[PDB]
Amino acid sequence: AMSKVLVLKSSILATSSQSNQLADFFVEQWQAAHAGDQITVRDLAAQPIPVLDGELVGALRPSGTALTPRQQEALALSDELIAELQANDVIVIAAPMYNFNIPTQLKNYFDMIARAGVTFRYTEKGPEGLVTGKRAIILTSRGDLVVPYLRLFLGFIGITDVEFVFAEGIAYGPEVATKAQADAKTLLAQVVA
Amino acid sequence: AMSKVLVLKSSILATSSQSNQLADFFVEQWQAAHAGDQITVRDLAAQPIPVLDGELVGALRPSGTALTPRQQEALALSDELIAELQANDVIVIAAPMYNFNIPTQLKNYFDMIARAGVTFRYTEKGPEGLVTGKRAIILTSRGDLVVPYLRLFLGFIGITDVEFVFAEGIAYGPEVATKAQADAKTLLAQVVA
Ligand SMILES: Cc1cc2nc3c(=O)[nH]c(=O)nc-3n(C[C@H](O)[C@H](O)[C@H](O)COP(=O)(O)O)c2cc1C
Ligand SMILES: Cc1cc2nc3c(=O)[nH]c(=O)nc-3n(C[C@H](O)[C@H](O)[C@H](O)COP(=O)(O)O)c2cc1C
Ligand SMILES: Cc1cc2nc3c(=O)[nH]c(=O)nc-3n(C[C@H](O)[C@H](O)[C@H](O)COP(=O)(O)O)c2cc1C
Numbered sequence: 291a292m293s294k295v296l297v298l299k300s301s302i303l304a305t306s307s308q309s310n311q312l313a314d315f316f317v318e319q320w321q322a323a324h325a326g327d328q329i330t331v332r333d334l335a336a337q338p339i340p341v342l343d344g345e346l347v348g349a350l351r352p353s354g355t356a357l358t359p360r361q362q363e364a365l366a367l368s369d370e371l372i373a374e375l376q377a378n379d380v381i382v383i384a385a386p387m388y389n390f391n392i393p394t395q396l397k398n399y400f401d402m403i404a405r406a407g408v409t410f411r412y413t414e415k416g417p418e419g420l421v422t423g424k425r426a427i428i429l430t431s432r433g434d435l436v437v438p439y440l441r442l443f444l445g446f447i448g449i450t451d452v453e454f455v456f457a458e459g460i461a462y463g464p465e466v467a468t469k470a471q472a473d474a475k476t477l478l479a480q481v482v483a
Numbered sequence: 484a485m486s487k488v489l490v491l492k493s494s495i496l497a498t499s500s501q502s503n504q505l506a507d508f509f510v511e512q513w514q515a516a517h518a519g520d521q522i523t524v525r526d527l528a529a530q531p532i533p534v535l536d537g538e539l540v541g542a543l544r545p546s547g548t549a550l551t552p553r554q555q556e557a558l559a560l561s562d563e564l565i566a567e568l569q570a571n572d573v574i575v576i577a578a579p580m581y582n583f584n585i586p587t588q589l590k591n592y593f594d595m596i597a598r599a600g601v602t603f604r605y606t607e608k609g610p611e612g613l614v615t616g617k618r619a620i621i622l623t624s625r626g627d628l629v630v631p632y633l634r635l636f637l638g639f640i641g642i643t644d645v646e647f648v649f650a651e652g653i654a655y656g657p658e659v660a661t662k663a664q665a666d667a668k669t670l671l672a673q674v675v676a
């Protein structure tokens with residue numbers, strides 16, 4: 291019981307995903323280096339988060355009105371995702387670049403967790419994040435506005451320890467066995483240690 | 484028949500939307516200044532575009548396989564949206580900032596229109612955009628990584644004439660009648676003329 295680690299997968303390419311392969315290598319390496327740690331994984335493609343629309347945005351703010359079933363479900367989901375984030379110490383986010391942005395799968399997660407009065411709040415001296423004491427490790431790809439955006443968003447909710455890892459080709463495609471794993475060990479050595 | 488104008492709305496706040504109010508003022512002003520022009524409007528919240536997932540990404544690339552009904556529907560939708568874009572000369576995009584990104588409503592549109600071999604293609608000298616001869620006017624808000632992202636994405640598909648307008652408070656909220664409209668006339672004067 292040294293750290294609780296939450297891994298967020300967002301790729302839409304399932305098991306052939308480069309970033310999912312990297313996330314799995316990360317998990318293996320973390321387990322080996324930190325035997326007592328509790329790792330959990332949320333796959334945002336396998337269990338999609340709904341799109342923030344007019345109906346759902348109303349569910350996420352204080353109202354006091356009766357809510358539709360889908361509103362109730364979104365509010366409960368948001369609460370669950372936020373509790374999950376707060377319960378973990380290390381947040382590993384697999385965020386491949388899709389059309390110069392993050393995957394929508396991850397964006398929908400962000401739109402559920404960014405809630406005023408819950409994960410940030412306004413004070414007399416500006417906004418402050420309420421998700422404190424976290425370490426975030428971002429597994430991404432490069433070719434880049436996604437990186438400063440991730441730093442800004444995570445910072446806004448209180449996460450300033452944000453560490454980016456760029457898959458410089460590791461686990462790209464067809465590869466003799468053992469090779470991607472070894473290359474990933476080299477890549478992830480810094481963040482795992 | 485001087486220009487064909489396509490307006491894309493993406494706000495989730497419906498008629499109370501600042502950016503929808505601005506888009507409507509834009510339409511009124513454009514109509515007045517360019518009586519012969521054909522304007523059409525696509526509201527990406529009122530008619531949502533599906534999320535790009537594993538199933539839909541497969542529908543958008545050449546395969547030659549049988550496709551699921553939702554894949555067929557996404558391919559047809561993508562084709563329709565792309566034909567619409569190509570058929571218009573002036574593309575007006577209302578893109579308010581939501582959690583430091585564009586609305587998902589607009590992002591899903593982008594994920595349907597960004598297709599290799601259709602709206603861009605690779606050549607021996609790098610990628611080139613295939614949506615040529617367009618003028619894009621972006622109606623947005625400021626507090627900013629959304630702006631360079633929009634320029635990059637639109638540029639990638641071939642649109643280099645990209646003009647940003649920042650609603651410096653215009654049509655924010657409760658307002659005596661006629662005022663937002665007058666302020667919008669001042670704001671939009673440059674892009675309309
Ligand atoms: C729909 C789609 C869009 C993509 N867009 C970009 C892009 O804009 N820039 C880029 O460098 N790579 C892009 N890629 C490649 C991925 O970012 C690359 O595979 C990444 O390292 C891992 O993606 P994956 O984990 O989903 O396989 C795209 C891939 C897909 C499927
Ligand atoms: C003995 C041997 C067996 C290989 N078997 C495979 C294979 O089964 N499938 C595959 O995709 N690549 C295979 N490769 C290719 C490697 O995965 C890789 O593409 C290449 O050897 C890496 O060379 P590099 O480190 O200089 O980039 C094999 C390579 C060697 C030397
Ligand atoms: C869910 C949501 C998230 C928002 N996030 C931001 C933000 O990150 N930065 C900002 O300046 N304004 C933000 N806004 C305010 C809108 O960008 C502002 O109202 C914009 O000018 C027009 O939005 P609208 O057309 O949807 O009303 C947000 C509004 C909503 C509803």
Ligand SMILES: Cc1cc2nc3c(=O)[nH]c(=O)nc-3n(C[C@H](O)[C@H](O)[C@H](O)COP(=O)(O)O)c2cc1C
Pocket residue numbers: 657658659660662
């Ligand atoms: C005669 C008069 C009537 C107004 N009626 C309304 C109103 O019905 N509803 C409203 O929200 N604001 C109303 N306002 C306020 C204006 O919309 C606006 O908030 C303010 O007058 C703008 O002042 P400014 O240009 O210095 O910012 C009214 C203002 C005046 C002078």
